[PDB]
Amino acid sequence: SPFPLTSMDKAFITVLEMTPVLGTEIINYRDGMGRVLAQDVYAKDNLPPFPASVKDGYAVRAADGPGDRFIIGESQAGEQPTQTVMPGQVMRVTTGAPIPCGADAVVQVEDTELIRESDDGTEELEVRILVQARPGQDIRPIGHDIKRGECVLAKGTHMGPSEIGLLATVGVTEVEVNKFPVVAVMSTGNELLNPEDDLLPGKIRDSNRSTLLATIQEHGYPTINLGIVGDNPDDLLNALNEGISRADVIITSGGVSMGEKDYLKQVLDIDLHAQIHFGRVFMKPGLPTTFATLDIDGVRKIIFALPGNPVSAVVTCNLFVVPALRKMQGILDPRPTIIKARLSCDVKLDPRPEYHRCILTWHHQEPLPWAQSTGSRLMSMRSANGLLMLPPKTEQYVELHKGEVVDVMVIGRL
């Protein structure tokens, strides 16, 4: 317009407030990594479902006390015992095996001495119990770990490997979860060639599409490649319409400044009839970053029109797009993790809040990590895992110094 300068805080809140939560679907539990449960999950069985030995040893009657006992048989994992242990008798048990009727404690083998075995040495016949067992010792009673009817996972749970294991444990192999967003990515500019192309006069290769698609894929979300679109409103509208049809989220880069061949804001408003919530953000880099929504038949589509400069595109993707996607896939608090780190070098502050990719590293025993802004040789074998978040300068603070503590958004595996 130019659009009003929007503060970072307002822009970020606006993205989260205006972004929808996707609907739900039933998935197989093996496909649950990173998904958010949209149902509570209950156990239909006890764990353990039988009284289970926690040791290799003997199932005994505690009342018998220590002494010499006839071994009447063995309880092995996976088989329900049929015999009842009577006074003066014991049954061999292994870890995880059921406790036979008549026994009320387990004595571990280390607290015993073998008296007699078969001539072939394959069968134990008589054992000395050296200790006084406590009633119930070394037995997991029925339901000790999980009770039938217990809620073991609550709706809203963001699942990792252990949650998948718990679903397996309780036999709940299909669960309701939020859908993942499908994210379409488009590059714009008459100067852009595909990565596969040799250069031609006046042209460069499109890098943003690759970088943005990889960023989204890193977070586990399905993507759509919408290719390169030229600087003209008809082609841009057609590409946006394809994105809307095929995806939940459309990410563009380029063409959002006020230049003569920058059409995206006009197309979003006048042709697409989308609602542009902000078109400029008071931030460095990322000034022309644009966020729009489009409501079609009770479905809200999300559009991020990011700056064309490659550094600006990847920075703004991490600040605005990734949290939106986290909200869409059902994460209750979709905010990124922000940690405290020490600056590895002095840095000049800008009137705008500043953001820069960095590498976070821990040093021996020092409690806080160091943040080294990207751009020793070894500090190049590693990809950026942080985004430095530097404050606006004040009449007081014009610079931050090496060692001073700053906020860093986590954007990669530490």
User: Are the beta carbons of 105 and 141 closer than 8 angstroms?
Assistant: no
Please identify, using beta-carbon distances, which residue of 288 and 323 lies nearer to ligand ADP.
288
- Of 20, 41, 115, 34, nearest to 71 by C-alpha is 115
Q: Work out whether 161 is an interface residue with its own copies (CB under 8 A).
A: yes
DSSP string, 153-168: E-TT-B--HHHHHHHH
* Distance in Å, CB of 161 to its own copies, minimum: 4
Residues β-bridged to residue 299: 296
d(CA 393, CA 248): 38
Cα–Cα distances (Å) from 77 to 48, 74, 104, 135, in that order, read 12, 10, 18, 22
Pick the binder of ligand MOO from 51, 288, 330, 369 (CB under 6 A): 288
Residue span 268-307 as binding mask against Mo ion, x where in contact by CB under 5 A, dash where not: -----------------x-x--------------------
Q: Pick from 181, 189, 243, 353 the residue near Ca ion by CB under 5 A.
A: 189
281 counts as binding ligand ADP under rule CB under 6 A:
no
Six-digit token string for 371: 């943040």
How many residues of this chain interact with its own copies, rule: CB under 8 A?
Answer: 98
Q: What angle do CA 321, 327, 333 make, to 5 degrees?
A: 115
Residues contacting Mo ion: total by CB under 5 A: 3
Determine which residue in the list 178, 215, 312, 318 makes contact with ligand MOO, applying CB under 6 A.
Answer: 312
> Using CB under 6 A, which of 81, 243, 279, 307 touches ligand ADP?
307
Residues 372-401, interacting with ligand ADP (CB under 6 A): none
Q: Among 46, 257, 293, 344, which residue interacts with ligand ADP (rule: CB under 6 A)? A: 257
Residue list 291-350, contact with its own copies (CB under 8 A):
308, 310, 314, 332, 337-340
d(CA 104, CA 62) in angstroms, rounded, equals 6
Candidates 32, 51, 98, 255: give the one binding ligand ADP (CB under 6 A): 255
Q: Write out the binding residues for Mo ion, residues 300-319 only, by CB under 5 A.
A: 309
Q: Which stretch binds ligand MOO (CB under 6 A): 107-115, 203-211, 281-289, 378-386?
A: 281-289
Question: Could you tell me which residues come within 8 angstroms of residue 281 by beta carbon, excluding any fewer than 6 positions away?
Answer: 5, 6, 7, 8, 11, 287, 289
The conformational region for residue 161 under phi > 0 = left, psi -120 to 50 = alpha, else beta, is alpha
CB closer to ligand MOO out of 288 and 323: 288
Instruction: Give CA–CA dist 241/252, Å, rounded.
Output: 13
* 57 lies in the site for ligand ADP, by CB under 6 A: no
**CA 242, 244, 247: angle at the middle one, nearest 5?**
100
Footprint of Ca ion on residues 214-273 (CB under 5 A)?
254-255
Which of 222, 227, 310, 392 is in the footprint of ligand ADP by CB under 6 A? 310
Q: Give, for 245, the enclosing helix (H) or strand (E).
A: helix 233-246
Instruction: Concatenate the DSSP letters of all residues of 180-229 into one string.
Output: PPPEEEEEE-TTEE-TTSPP-TT-EE--HHHHHHHHHHHTT--EEEEEEE
**Which residues of the shown chain bind ligand MOO in the complex (CB under 6 A)?**
285-288, 307, 309, 312
**Which residues of the shown chain bind ligand ADP in the complex (CB under 6 A)?**
77, 95-96, 187, 189, 191-192, 204, 206-209, 253-257, 259, 262, 288, 307-310
